[PDB]
Design a protein around this ligand. Structure first.
Ligand SMILES: *[C@@H]1O[C@H](CO)[C@@H](O)[C@H](O)[C@H]1NC(C)=O
Ligand code: NA
Lengths: 117, 33
């Protein structure tokens, strides 16, 4: 069965830092971009829509502009890594990663934003 | 059969993107007994 797995289901991240949240999917030999969809979402805000290799900045939610990207080097290894720079208090919440690659699946990841002192 | 239900959720999510379909609810229901 096609399964998406998360190495971590909880990330505790510092306010103003950078986070990379990971979502793994099975890759046999080389990645085929023509068969791959990656969708990152957070409480109905669309962060990444990677459709068969194609990304459209116009449909990224305004709260993630210039802060969120899908790391392409990880993608080759079956790792859909979402990097968010300059983490905001509003970035706290439940992220969903949906991967379609042959089959389809999704996982939830909780992000908590701390302000250490 | 479950695999096929999930592929179809993605199909309908894509169709929507052309034309508010909740793909996570759809995928959930494929796994739901
Ligand atoms: C986050 O990324 C930027 C470059 O994109 C880097 O300059 C910065 O040091 C990183 N932030 C932290 C707190 O590590
Ligand atoms: Na810290």
């Amino acid at each position: 069965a096609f399964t998406v797995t998360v190495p971590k289901d909880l990330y505790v991240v510092e306010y103003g830092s950078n986070m990379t949240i990971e979502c793994k999917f099975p890759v046999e030999k080389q990645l085929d971009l023509a068969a791959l969809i990656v969708y990152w979402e957070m409480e109905d805000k669309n962060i990444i829509q990677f459709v068969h290799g194609e990304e459209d900045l116009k449909v990224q939610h305004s709260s993630y502009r210039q802060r969120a990207r899908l790391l392409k080097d990880q993608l080759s290894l079956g790792n859909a890594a979402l990097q968010i720079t300059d983490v905001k208090l509003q970035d706290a919440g439940v992220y969903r990663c949906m991967i379609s690659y042959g089959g389809a699946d999704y996982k939830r990841i909780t992000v908590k934003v701390n302000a250490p002192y | 059969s479950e695999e096929d239900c999930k592929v179809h959720c993605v199909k309908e999510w894509m169709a929507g993107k052309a034309c508010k379909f909740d793909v996570f609810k759809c995928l959930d229901h494929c796994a739901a007994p």
